[PDB]
Structure 1
Amino acid sequence: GVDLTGISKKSRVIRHHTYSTNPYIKLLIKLYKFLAKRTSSGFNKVVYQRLIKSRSNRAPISLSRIAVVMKRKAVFTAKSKAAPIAVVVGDVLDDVRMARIPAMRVCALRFSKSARQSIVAAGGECLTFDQLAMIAPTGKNTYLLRGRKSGRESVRHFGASGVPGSHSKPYATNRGKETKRGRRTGRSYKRKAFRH
């Protein structure tokens, strides 16, 4: 007997294989597992790790955010070097709040019809990951991007709404029903909006 108390609490929960039913996703995973195994770059390892994730953990990104971060990188870059390739493991959606964008090369798993049209009209190219594996087999001169996760309604619902310092929404279908007692000082009390 060996004393190994609390040794199962060190185990980590990882995924290691995909639950997706998409044959094209399986083909992409087949390519990038090989690349991550046989290549020394960290770009391939990160991309392979993100292809295995679930749909909820691959949030969509926006064309306006792509344009803004690319410009902020470009202001401090030599005038003779070429702009990088924006890479997102996810979907690229359009923005009606930004009308004119530069010419960029973007690679993604999926494009909206409007996003594709906007990019090509501005003068760029929409690439696929098998094309990227042939342009940049190691990922040199790329910009790896992620989409936004907070601001989702589920995240804003997480928590208990009636403890001090808590600003999460309750689960309720009638908006005018849960006000009053515990939410106004005129009633018994009001839960405190701040706590150290």
Structure 2
Amino acid sequence: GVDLTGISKKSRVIRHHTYSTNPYIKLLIKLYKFLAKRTSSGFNKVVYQRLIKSRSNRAPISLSRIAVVMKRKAVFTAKSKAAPIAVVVGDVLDDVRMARIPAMRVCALRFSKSARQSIVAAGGECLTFDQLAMIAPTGKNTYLLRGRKSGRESVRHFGASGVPGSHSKPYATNRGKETKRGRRTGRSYKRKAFRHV
């Protein structure tokens, strides 16, 4: 026998195949598993890992965030060079708060219809991942992008709301209930807004 105390602690849970039933996601996973094995690109590797991920972990992105980050990159980029292709393994959603966007090349798993319309009407084009594999087989001159997940309602509800320094939302159907003892100084006590970590 060999002393391996809690060696099971070092094993890590990693998705190695997709739970998706979508046949086209499976075709894309085939393509990019081949590209990640047979090329030196880090872009292909990360695209493959994201392709096998769960939908919750492929957060959607807004068109406005894409435009803003592409602008921050466009300055300090030589005006000789062309703008990178923005790549998101996920969904692109339209944004009503940004009417005026530049011509952008975007590759996404899916576009919302209004997002696709806005991108095209601004002069850009909507790509799929097979076209991207055709014209950027190693992901040269690309901008890999992720959507936001920290504003999610589930994230806002995580953790006990009655411990000092917590500001999580409680699981409650009635907003007016649970506004008393424990939340006001005049009702016995109030849970502290701040605690030093």
- Range into which the TM-score falls when normalised by the shorter chain: over 0.9
Which of 106-115 and 185-194 deviates more?
A: 185-194
Measured against aligned partners, the alpha-carbon deviations of 1:38-87 in whole angstroms (never above 9, x if no partner) come to 00110000000000000000000000000000010001011211111000
Q: Normalising by structure 1, what TM-score?
A: 0.99
Which 5+ residue runs of structure 1 have no aligned equivalent?
Answer: none
Q: Normalising by structure 2, what TM-score?
A: 0.98
Aligned equivalents of 1:68, 1:3: Cα separation in 2 = 54
Measured against aligned partners, the alpha-carbon deviations of 1:127-149 in whole angstroms (never above 9, x if no partner) come to 00000001011100000000000
The offset of 1:185, in angstroms, is 1.0
Q: Which residue does 1:179 correspond to in 2?
A: 179
Written as runs of structure 1 = structure 2, the 5 A alignment for 1:7-46 is 7-46=7-46
Aligned equivalents of 1:79, 1:26: Cα separation in 2 = 38
Aligned equivalents of 2:67, 2:5: Cα separation in 1 = 52
The offset of 1:110, in angstroms, is 0.3
The offset of 1:36, in angstroms, is 0.5
Are 2:82 and 1:117 equivalent residues in the alignment? no
- Structure 1 stretches of at least 4 aligned residues deviating more than 3 Å after TM superposition: none
Written as runs of structure 1 = structure 2, the 5 A alignment for 1:67-146 is 67-146=67-146
The offset of 1:15, in angstroms, is 0.9
The offset of 1:33, in angstroms, is 0.4
Q: Which residue does 1:147 correspond to in 2?
A: 147
Measured against aligned partners, the alpha-carbon deviations of 1:84-132 in whole angstroms (never above 9, x if no partner) come to 1000000000000001100010000000110111011000110000000
Measured against aligned partners, the alpha-carbon deviations of 1:20-47 in whole angstroms (never above 9, x if no partner) come to 0011010000000001000011000000
Which of 121-130 and 186-195 deviates more?
A: 186-195
Aligned equivalents of 2:182, 2:40: Cα separation in 1 = 58
The offset of 1:187, in angstroms, is 1.4
Measured against aligned partners, the alpha-carbon deviations of 1:1-32 in whole angstroms (never above 9, x if no partner) come to 11111111110001100010011010000000
% same residue: 100
